Amino acid sequence: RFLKVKNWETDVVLTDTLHLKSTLETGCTEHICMGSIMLPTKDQLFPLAKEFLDQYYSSIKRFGSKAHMDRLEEVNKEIESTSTYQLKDTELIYGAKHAWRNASRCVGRIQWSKLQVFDARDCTTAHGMFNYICNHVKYATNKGNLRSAITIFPQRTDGKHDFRVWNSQLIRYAGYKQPDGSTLGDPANVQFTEICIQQGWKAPRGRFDVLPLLLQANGNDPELFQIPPELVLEVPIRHPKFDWFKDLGLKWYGLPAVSNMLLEIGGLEFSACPFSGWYMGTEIGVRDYCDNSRYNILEEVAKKMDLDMRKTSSLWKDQALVEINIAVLYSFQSDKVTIVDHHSATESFIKHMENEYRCRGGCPADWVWIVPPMSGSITPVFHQEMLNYRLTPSFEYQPDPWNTHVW
Amino acid sequence: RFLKVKNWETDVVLTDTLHLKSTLETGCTEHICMGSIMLPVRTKDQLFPLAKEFLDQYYSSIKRFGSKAHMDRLEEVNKEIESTSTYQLKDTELIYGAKHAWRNASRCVGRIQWSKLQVFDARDCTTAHGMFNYICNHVKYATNKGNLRSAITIFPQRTDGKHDFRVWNSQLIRYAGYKQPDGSTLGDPANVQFTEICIQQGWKAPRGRFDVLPLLLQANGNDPELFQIPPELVLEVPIRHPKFDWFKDLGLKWYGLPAVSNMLLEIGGLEFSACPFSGWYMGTEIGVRDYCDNSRYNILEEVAKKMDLDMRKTSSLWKDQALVEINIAVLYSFQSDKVTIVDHHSATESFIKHMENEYRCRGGCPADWVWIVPPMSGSITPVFHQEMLNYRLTPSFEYQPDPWNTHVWKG
Ligand code: HEM
Ligand code: HEM
Ligand SMILES: CNCc1cccc(OCc2ccc3c(C)cc(N)nc3c2)c1
Ligand SMILES: CNCc1cccc(OCc2ccc3c(C)cc(N)nc3c2)c1
Ligand SMILES: C[C@H](O)[C@H](O)[C@H]1CNc2nc(N)[nH]c(=O)c2N1
Ligand SMILES: C[C@H](O)[C@H](O)[C@H]1CNc2nc(N)[nH]c(=O)c2N1
Ligand SMILES: [Zn+2]
C-alpha cells in the first residue's frame, strides 16, 4: 500500500505515499479499469473544512497551534450558524494553487506555485463579472508574455444563486452549420454559438470569430458581453519553410483560459472560476487543427504538400501533422507569445514528478492525458508509470448551464 | 450492471455486459488507478472451478451447453483431477483456449485476426532438441516466404512447477546486444542481459549490430540448451527510404516475424509456460519503439543529422520529423519485399471495427487504451478518441518471471 512507480527508460523508481491521503473516488474497481473514460449539508461541510484547514496549517508549519485550533473553532462556529463559511484570503490563494497542483491531467503543473489569484468574491452582477474577466485577460496576456491566473467568483450557496461563465473558454472561435451541410469555424462550439445567437449575438459568420462572453451572476439569466478586441491577442499561423502556409488562412489566440470548471476548496464550491496559463503547441496544432470533429485541416494541408494521399501507409497524415505543429510553434515564438513544445513540457513534468515525490511523497497523474497526442513514446512521460488518484482541493467538471438554468 | 463507452469523435455509444464475466483483478481500486503500471504450483482445491468455467464457456461456444457430451466431459475432468491432481485438454479445447487467450488480450490491437490462429500442439515434446524442431517448423510455417500467418506452438503444461518447459528468449527472433568497456552498447540494448547468458552458455557471438540470437530452450525443468535457428529460416528486411537514398547506408535491417516466447498461456486453470506465438508487425513497433526509443537502437540523432534538421532546439520538432521518415522507411521496405506488415492507421481502424463487432456479438471487448494507442500520432488514429474498458478474462496470456531468475541449475 506504499506504491512504487517505475520509469522504464531510466529505471528510476519512486515511492508513492501521498495517495493514501486520497478521499474522492476514481471510477475504477479491482474488477475493471475506467482509466480512459473521459468523465466518471452542515454535517457534510465540517469534515471537509477541517481537512482543508488541517493541510493548510500544516503547510505553514503551524499544525496544532492556537491559530490552527482557533480557526478550526471559528469556522466550526460559522458553519453551525450560517450553514456555510468563508475562506480567509490566504486560504483562498492556497486552495487555488493546490487545486492546480492536484490536477492529475495537467502536464504543466511545474508552474503550480506561481499562480496569480484574483479574488472576485465581492462581485454581484454580470457587468461586474465582465470587468473582472477583462482585467484577468489583460493581466494574463501581458502583451504576449503570459502569466498564469485565476479569477474566483462568489461560492455556491443554495444552488439557485450560482455564478457561472457559460463559455467553455474565455476565448474561443464560433461554430456555424452551413446549409450546404458542412461546418464553418469551430464545430466544437456550434451549440454554444447557437445559444449566443439565440440570445442576441450578431455573428459575422466568419471562420475565426471570437465568441461573446455569456455571464451569469447570482443565478440570474446570463448576459452577452463582447471582449475588447485589443485584449484578444491572436497569432497568424505561418510555416518557416512553406510560404504557401500563410494562405491557408489560419490563426489562433494566445490565451488558453478555461471557464466551465468548478473549484472545490474545503467543501466550498466555486462554480465560476476561469483560469488560464499558456498553450502547449499540440493543443492547437494536433487537437484543435487536426481532430476530425474540429478544424480538421489535415487533408488540405497534405494536398498543398503534394503528398501521396492514396494509401495510408505513406504516413502523409503523419508528415502533415508534424509540419502543422512546426508552424504553430514557429508562429507563436516569432510573435513573442509564450508557448511550450511537447518535448519541453513533458521533460518539465518529469522533473516536477521527481520534485513532488521528493517533497510531498507523490504526484497524482493521468497517463492517458499527460502523454501528448503526438510522438508519444519519444517523450519521457510515455515510459513513466503514473498513479492516478483524486486529491482535494480540486477542479471538477460541472454540467453545462443551459441544461440546468431555470430561465 | 451495464456499462457504456463513448467515442468522442463519432459519438457512438456502446454497452458492456461482458465485464460481468471478469474474475481476475485489475490492480485498481476506487481510490487508485494503476492503468499505466506495466506489470500490476496450483492445487486440486482451486483447479476444478477453473476447469468447469472453461468447459462451460467451451461447450457454450459450440452450442452444446448442458448436453450429455458437456456433462460427461465435466465428469471426466473431475475424476482425472482428483485422481491425478491435474487434467489434459482435448485438441478442440486447446485450440479454443489459445484463440480466446488472444481474443481476451486487452493490450493487443491486432485482435481482429483472433479466429485465424494456427495452433501447433507440441504437448508430446520431451526434450530441448524436440523443442528446437517444433520451433523451427513454427518459424517456417509462420514466415511463409513473407506472407505471414499467425501461429502458436504449445508445449506441455506445468505440473509441479519443478519441470517447466520454457523458452528463455523473449522473442524467437531477436538481435544480440553487447555492452562495451567504454559503456556504449553494440546491437540491441534491450537484449544485453540475455546475450550475456547465451555467451556464458557457450554461444560464440559474431559481435555485430544485428546478430540473430540463438534459441535457449528448457524442457521438463532441465538446464536450457543452445540452438541456432537455420539462417534460411530467418526472414530479414533491409531498411531503405523511398526518397532518401542515404537511408540504406544507415545499415539497418529488421526481422520479419514478431514471435513472443516469454509469456504464459492459461486455459481452464492449466498453465502453459512455453507457448511461443507470432503474428505480423505493426510498423511502429519497429520504426518508433525498436529504432527510436532512447534505450533501443536510438537512431533519431543520426537520421536527424543526415536530414539536416535544426537540432539546436526541440521546438524545431526535429525529433518528430525524423520519427516519421523512419516509420515511412520501415513500411516502404517491408511492402517492397512483400513481407506482411500493417501501418498504425490501418490497424487502429480495424481494431475499432473489431471492437464494435465484439460489443454486438459478445457484449464487450476488454481493451487497454494505454497500450492500444500507437506510440506516434496518437490522436489522428481513431482509437485515441475511443473510451475503453479494461478487465481480465480467461483464457489469457500472462507475464511470468524471467527463467534465469527462478531456475534451479542442475549442472
Ligand atoms: C501554465 C502553463 C500550462 C500548461 C502548458 C498546461 C497544459 C495542459 C494540457 C496540455 C492539458 C491537456 C488538456 C487538453 O488536452 O484539453 C491540461 C489540462 C488541465 N490543466 Fe493545465 N496547463 C497549464 C496551466 C494550468 C493552470 C494555471 C491551471 C489551473 C489553475 C491548469 C489546470 C488544468 C486542469 C484542471 C486540466 C484538466 C482539465 C480537464 O480535466 O479536462 N493548467 N493542461
Ligand atoms: C497478427 C498480427 C498482430 C498484430 C499487428 C499485433 C499487434 C500488437 C501490438 C502492436 C502489440 C503491442 C506490442 C508492444 O508495444 O510491445 C501487441 C500486444 C500483444 N499481442 Fe498482438 N498482434 C498480432 C498478433 C497477435 C497474436 C497471434 C497473438 C497471440 C496469439 C497476440 C497477442 C498479444 C498479446 C498477449 C499482447 C500483449 C503483450 C503484453 O501484454 O506485453 N497478438 N500486439
Ligand atoms: C475537451 N476536453 C475536455 C475538457 C473539458 C473541460 C475543459 C478542458 O480543458 C482542458 C484544459 C484546461 C486548462 C488549460 C490551461 C489552464 C492551459 C492549457 N495550456 N491548456 C488547458 C487545457 C477540457
Ligand atoms: C518489453 N515490452 C513488454 C512486453 C513483454 C513481453 C512480451 C511483450 O509482447 C508484446 C507483443 C506480443 C506479441 C506480438 C505479436 C504476436 C505480434 C506483434 N506484431 N506484436 C506483438 C507484441 C511485451
Ligand atoms: C509506463 C507505461 O505503462 C509504459 O511505458 C507502456 C505504455 N504503453 C505502451 N504501449 C505499447 N503498445 N507498448 C508498450 O511497451 C507500452 N509501454
Ligand atoms: C477517449 C479518450 O480517453 C479521450 O480521447 C482522451 C484521451 N486523452 C486525452 N488527453 C488530453 N490531453 N486531452 C484529451 O482531450 C484527451 N482525450
Ligand atoms: Zn484504473
Q: Which residues of A286-319 are buried (b: 16+ CB within 10 A; e: fewer)?
A: bbbbbbeebbebbeebbebeebeeeebbbbbbbb
Note whether B377 and B92 are within 8 A (CB): no
Cell of B210: 544485428
Cα separation values, B362 from A110, A292, B128, Å:
45, 29, 40
DSSP letter, residue A7: B
Catalytic residue among A100, A112, A278, A316: A278
Q: Which residues contact A179 (CB under 8 A, 6 or more apart)?
A: none
Segments making up each domain of chain A, as ranges: 16-121+148-158+262-276+346-370, 122-147+162-233+397-401, 234-256+279-344
Q: Which one, of B117, B118, B120, B103, lies nearest residue B154 by Cα? A: B120
CB contact under 8 A, A26 and B27: no
Q: Which one, of A46, A215, A42, lies nearest residue A123 by Cα? A: A215
Residue nearest to atom 7 of ligand 4 (CA): B260
Compute the C-alpha angle B270/B271/B276, nearest 5°. Answer: 130
Note whether A237 and A250 are within 8 A (CB): yes
Atom nearest to A395 CA in ligand 1: 35
Note whether A213 and A165 are within 8 A (CB): yes
Cα separation values, B288 from A240, B65, B122, B328, B376, Å:
26, 46, 34, 11, 7
CB contact under 8 A, A326 and B316: yes
User: How far does Cα A358 stand from its chain's mean position?
Assistant: 26
User: How far does Cα B308 stand from its chain's mean position?
Assistant: 37
Note whether A94 and A112 are within 8 A (CB): no
Reduced to 3 states, what is the DSSP secondary structure of residue B175?
A: strand
Q: Left (φ > 0), alpha (ψ -120 to 50) or beta: where does B402 sit? A: beta
Q: Which one, of A62, A197, A280, lies nearest residue A185 by Cα? A: A197
Cell of A156: 455556491
Is A132 annotated to bind a ligand? Reply is: no
Residue with cell 555485430: B208
Cell of A279: 498553450
Q: Which one, of B278, B296, B265, B74, lies nearest residue B185 by Cα? A: B296
Amino acid at A14: L
Catalytic residue among A91, A264, A283, A356: A283
Query: What is the third-level CATH fold of A16-121+148-158+262-276+346-370?
Result: Nitric Oxide Synthase; Chain A, domain 1 (3.90.340)
Amino acid at B58: Y
Q: Which residues of B115-136 are buried (b: 16+ CB within 10 A; e: fewer)?
A: eebbbbbbeebeebebbbebbb
Task: Kindly state which CATH superfamily the domain A234-256+279-344 is placed in.
Answer: Nitric Oxide Synthase; Chain A, domain 3 (3.90.1230.10)
Q: How far is B90 from chain A (nearest CA, A)?
A: 30
Resolution of the model in angstroms: 2.0
Tell me the residue length of chain A: 407
Which ligand has an atom closest to residue B374 CA? Answer: 5
Residue with cell 450578431: A202
Which CATH number, 3.40.50.720, 3.10.130.10, 3.90.440.10, 3.50.50.60, labels domain A122-147+162-233+397-401? 3.90.440.10
Amino acid at B122: A
Of B38, B343, B379, the CB nearest to A287: B379
Atom nearest to B278 CA in ligand 2: 27
Note whether B114 and B361 are within 8 A (CB): no
Query: What is the third-level CATH fold of B16-123+150-160+264-278+348-372?
Result: Nitric Oxide Synthase; Chain A, domain 1 (3.90.340)
Reduced to 3 states, what is the DSSP secondary structure of residue B374?
A: coil
Residue with cell 472451478: B49
Query: What is the third-level CATH fold of B236-258+281-346?
Result: 3.90.1230
Q: Which residues contact A192 (CB under 8 A, 6 or more apart)?
A: A166, A167, A168, A172, A175, A211, A214
In the sheet where B264-267 sits, what is the strand order? B270-272, B264-267, B396-398
Reduced to 3 states, what is the DSSP secondary structure of residue B33?
A: strand
Tell me how crowded residue A11 is: count the other CB atoms within 10 A of its CB: 8
**What CA–CA distance (Å, rounded) separates A22 from A287?**
31
The experimental technique behind this entry is: X-ray
Note whether A115 and A148 are within 8 A (CB): yes
For ligand 1, the distance from its centroid to the CA atom of residue A276, given in whole angstroms, is 8
A316 is an active site residue: no
Ligand 4: which of B39, B260, B330 to mutate, judged by most atoms within 8 Å of the beta carbon?
Answer: B260
Q: Would strands B151-154 and B118-121 be described as parallel, antiparallel, or unpaired?
A: parallel
**What CA–CA distance (Å, rounded) separates B276 from B273?**
9
Torsion sign, CA atoms A292, A298, A300, A303: negative
**What CA–CA distance (Å, rounded) separates A404 from A276?**
25
Reduced to 3 states, what is the DSSP secondary structure of residue A215?
A: strand
Note whether A356 and A362 are within 8 A (CB): yes
B108 is an active site residue: yes
Q: Which one, of B145, B118, B113, B101, lies nearest residue B346 by Cα? A: B113
For ligand 5, the distance from its centroid to the CA atom of residue B245, given in whole angstroms, is 32
Reduced to 3 states, what is the DSSP secondary structure of residue B105?
A: coil
A273 is an active site residue: no
Longest dimension (CA), chain B: 74
CB contact under 8 A, B32 and A22: yes
Cα separation values, A154 from A216, A217, A307, B236, Å:
11, 9, 54, 67
CB contact under 8 A, B378 and A377: no
CB B285 less than 6 A from any atom of ligand 4: yes
How would DSSP label each residue in A240-305? SS-TTGGGG--EEES--EE-S-EEEETTEEES---EE--EEHHIIIIIIHH-TTTT--HHHHHHHH
| CATH architecture of the region B124-149+164-235+399-403 | Alpha-Beta Complex (3.90)
